[PDB]
Amino acid sequence: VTDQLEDLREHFKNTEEGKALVHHYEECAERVKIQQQQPGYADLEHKEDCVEEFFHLQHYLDTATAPRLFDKLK
Amino acid sequence: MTAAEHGLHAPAYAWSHNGPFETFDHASIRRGYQVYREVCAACHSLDRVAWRTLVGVSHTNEEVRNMAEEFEYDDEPDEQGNPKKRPGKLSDYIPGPYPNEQAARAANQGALPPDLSLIVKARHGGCDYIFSLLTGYPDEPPAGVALPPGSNYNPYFPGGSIAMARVLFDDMVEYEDGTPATTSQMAKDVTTFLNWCAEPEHDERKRLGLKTVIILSSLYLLSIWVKKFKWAGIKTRKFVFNPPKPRK
Amino acid sequence: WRTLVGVSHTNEEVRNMAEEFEYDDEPDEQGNPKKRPGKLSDYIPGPYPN
Amino acid sequence: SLYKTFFKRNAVFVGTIFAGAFVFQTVFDTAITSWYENHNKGKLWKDVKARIAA
Amino acid sequence: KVEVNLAAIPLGKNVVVKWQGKPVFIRHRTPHEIQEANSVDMSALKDPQTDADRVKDPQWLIMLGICTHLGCVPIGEAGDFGGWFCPCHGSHYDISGRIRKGPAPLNLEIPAYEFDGDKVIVG
Amino acid sequence: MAFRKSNVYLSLVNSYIIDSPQPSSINYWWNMGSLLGLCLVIQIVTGIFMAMHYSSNIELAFSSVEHIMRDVHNGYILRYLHANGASFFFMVMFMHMAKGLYYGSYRSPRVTLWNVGVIIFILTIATAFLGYCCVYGQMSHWGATVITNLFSAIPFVGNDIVSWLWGGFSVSNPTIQRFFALHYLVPFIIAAMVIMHLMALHIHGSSNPLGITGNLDRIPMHSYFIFKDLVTVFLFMLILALFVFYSPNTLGHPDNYIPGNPLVTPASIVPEWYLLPFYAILRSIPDKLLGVITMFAAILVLLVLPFTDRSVVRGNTFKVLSKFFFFIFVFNFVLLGQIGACHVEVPYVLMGQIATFIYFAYFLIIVPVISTIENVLFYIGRVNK
Amino acid sequence: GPPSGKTYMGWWGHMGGPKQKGITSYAVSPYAQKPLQGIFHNAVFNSFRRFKSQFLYVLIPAGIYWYWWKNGNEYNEFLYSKAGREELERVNV
Ligand SMILES: CCCCCCCCCCCCCCCCCC(=O)OC[C@H](COP(=O)(O)OCCN)OC(=O)CCCCCCCCCCCCC
Ligand code: HEM
Ligand code: HEM
């Protein structure tokens, strides 16, 4: 028996609202990967991370899977 | 503070002891101790919980006199002053795994793992934070975050970098009643147990609270009548003015 | 040990009388117990442990 | 009358306030415990104690 | 008064003790770290201060690590110069304990420590 | 004569709670004085029965609050009735200092009554603070560290006062052990200043919500306002019992359940919620010496209120402008209890500097100006010339 | 006991109001009338008349300040975003 949250978090990952967010976070994660390969990156002191785009994705799954999860658990 | 320094918000899980009449699920405290003893008893003290508090909550009286005789506490010394040990009893406390603070920071890479006896009431979020902290570990940090070496990411911790790695994987304990021991089942069981460790009065407080708001909202509604009864002479008192003759 | 300073012994005669005994230091960076020589802020140690 | 028995003498007015608060003490405590346990059937300890049947 | 010895503090370990109910941050330095400490110009700091008026015996580093903002805790041998990093607001500090990178407006203070041979009187 | 008048003790009971002629038009805001008398007995009786189990050392402070909440029979009742009841003290009292600020109860001949109000208010702030630092939580160690380090700003006598106040060199064992024997005491000084507060009231009697003379229609206290107080006693007991049994840790901070550690600072040190407006006045001035004064001036600016009110009518009941600007002051006081909780961040420093200017321009600028305009408008509205 | 000062309240009999004459005060016993005679039609019609008067003195002091608090709390959350770090560098310093 697999866990009850991760499949539930996978089910709300690929809805219509989630796929506009998990693509939007992935678009941030590509701009990081071309900034992390340019010269002079280690001494740049302004590094864009995608914690804001990850937080929008994680908060959407948090509101959708909060009232539904505890029905699954024994 | 940005959103990363503040921590992600802990969502509202539908616990079985929320609401003004629901008690603890005592079948999930007996299964919540077993996740404590076999996962996080290795590195977390539970300093304030006596063994006798578990008798009649989650375990019976014979089960705690065998759970407490595994450990060894200090006895008063013998006839020649040599320090001797003894097996525990019901009146002793749940012992931590580390003999002092510096032995705790030496094992867990500097960071001191906090005592869990009041960790539910000492965190903003409550049970929704302690549950979502354990099930909040991603498989990788978000792209752009460089953690310090030896620290783990989960976003619900304030600041991102926590020093606890993911200690809940599927079927790492085996329950005594055949419940499927997933991570979401196990994190739900400790968080109900650590809520009992923090609030061991949560069953009796919510039934004396029922006995009081019934009386103190029927005493209050009786006193509106006896106020209005004893004020009916002045509430309905009528004045008239016949202006006197100015001859005086 | 500090009350003996100035009453019946000097300041160096007590810093060489408290460094004969040994008291419990705070433990090291591995949590092992350790001892230290005494100082002026400690009490005169009794001869029996309990 | 009813006034002539109960509410006339104050010695028997507060006699049947205390005798009506002594009955109310044991009845309302039992009728709350018997409701609060029945609202949470399946979650209390004596339900877990019976369900450990091996 | 705390009386830690003149032979106990090692080179590459950052001692953090509670003297007088306050955190005191100690390291033992090398002679090459004296000129390494004040190598940055005073104009690249928000306060001018050299290693001379901060530490008397620049081999023996004695610092009080109550930071100027909240009193947060620097971590030993972390940061961007091999000194001390304050993860509370990102106040980077050197091996001389002066603010270079971070929003702390002043350097961390120095307690009145005195050498008398085979001891230091930190009081 | 009657025995309630002929005895030396009972005539003090008679002239205060039985035969005291109260005006027959006072609304339910006149019960907040009787609630504060009940809410003082709640703190005192649940202080004696709680301090029989409390050891005041720095090692056994936080460990013996948890001994109350775990090991004493009904100990969770006592600790929660008294930590929440202290937060209900300051909510009834803030509605008691705002009845009298609204209905003109500060004016003459009741300036003696108002000045014992500000003295009781200062000792009650000092009592609830000194018991907060007795739990030795994380917000209470770093509360006492931030508060008692403000007295290190007095010139040349700063450090000697603080080191006398701490009883050492930092907040240590003698500070917590003396913040208990003081905090045991000051309630008995409040319980004597309350008797010195009923004497200042009894010579001229209570006001009435119209602001006119109440010597014409007077009804006694017994069976009229005894039973009008029993309504709000049984209501205040009800809203306290929801906040004690059903949601006890709602008002307090969660960080106060961490045992107090002087080595690790918390995220943001805030006081308990009722000192939060004055903490935002203290934090607004970009100076340390002026902050200690202005946070103390904000309690003492209530004393210039009998001399700045330039109205010939007592109270704001029949006034349009001085009833609008009163509720701007109340909702400014709530906003200062919110900027005290936010961090020192843009723009909560321009807000906390503006919304502390409106706290002080109410007593010094708004009330003398809009009450002179409210006397020419009462005059030229009736006089025809 | 000593004689005290001149106060603006006396006691029963010499209360110190103006002399009043020709004011008749009829009142019935509370045992002969019904309490809660008008608890309805006062909780609906009277309690709307009280609310109709004193609510523009409470709402406008709470519609100036709640708009002020909300228009700062959503400017504080713009500065601490990824989109407002180029504005925070010019206002914090
Ligand atoms: C150190 C300095 C101390 C200063 C203390 C600062 C204030 C403390 C906060 C406590 C708030 C207490 C508010 C009480 C206001 C005074 C009582 C009052 O004025 O009520 C009467 C008023 C109108 O009634 P009248 O008697 O004037 O009219 C008679 C006509 N025949 O009736 C009304 O107009 C309605 C009353 C509605 C009260 C609303 C209270 C709001 C409380 C803030 C909640 C914030 C949540 C957003
Ligand atoms: C069911 C298992 C566990 C639970 C519920 C739990 C709970 C917690 C909680 C509530 C915190 C505090 C987080 C905070 O302050 O925001 C914490 C921190 C910590 N835990 Fe766990 N813990 C568990 C298991 C473990 C284990 C097995 C380890 C083994 C090494 C561990 C190591 C730590 C450490 C080192 C910290 C401190 C991290 C820091 O403060 O930076 N924990 N834990
Ligand atoms: C005006 C009267 C009082 C007020 C406003 C007051 C307020 C407080 C407050 C705010 C606390 C901290 C509560 C917490 O955070 O848990 C407290 C704690 C405490 N107070 Fe009082 N108090 C009053 C009277 C008394 C009296 C008369 C006593 C003792 C005889 C007393 C003894 C205590 C004790 C022992 C604590 C222990 C810490 C705790 O368990 O909360 N208090 N008080």
Ligand code: HEM
């Ligand atoms: C432990 C705290 C207090 C107690 C027990 C107390 C007691 C009382 C009582 C019983 C009354 C008569 C009932 C009433 O008029 O509402 C009263 C009136 C009054 N109190 Fe207090 N009081 C306390 C605090 C304060 C404070 C902090 C202030 C003002 C800063 C204050 C100012 C007044 C005023 C102005 C009146 C007269 C109001 C009027 O009758 O027109 N009191 N007090």
Ligand SMILES: COc1c(O)c(C)c(C/C=C(\C)CC/C=C(\C)CC/C=C(/C)CC/C=C(\C)CC/C=C(\C)CCC=C(C)C)c(O)c1OC
């Ligand atoms: C103007 O008209 C009035 C008016 O005159 C009055 C008096 C009040 C009422 C106000 C008060 C009564 C306030 C006065 C309050 C005090 C004097 C506080 C005193 C309270 C105490 C609890 C005194 C302390 C005494 C004890 C704690 C004794 C209890 C003993 C204990 C706890 C030990 C128990 C141990 C054993 C072994 C039993 C009004 O509200 C009012 O307006 C209507």
Ligand SMILES: CCCCCCCCCCCCCCC(=O)O[C@H](COC(=O)CCCCCCCCCCCC)COP(=O)(O)O
């Ligand atoms: C001391 C700190 C302040 C406390 C504020 C309390 C103010 C109100 C006190 C109420 C006492 C009521 C007695 C009146 C009375 O005896 O009238 C008596 C009879 O009244 C009653 O029978 C009332 C029934 C008993 C009420 C019990 C209330 C106890 C709740 C205590 C809560 C406060 C501690 C005489 O009334 P009569 O002259 O109209 O005939």
Ligand code: FES
């Ligand atoms: S503690 Fe915040 S900058 Fe040093």
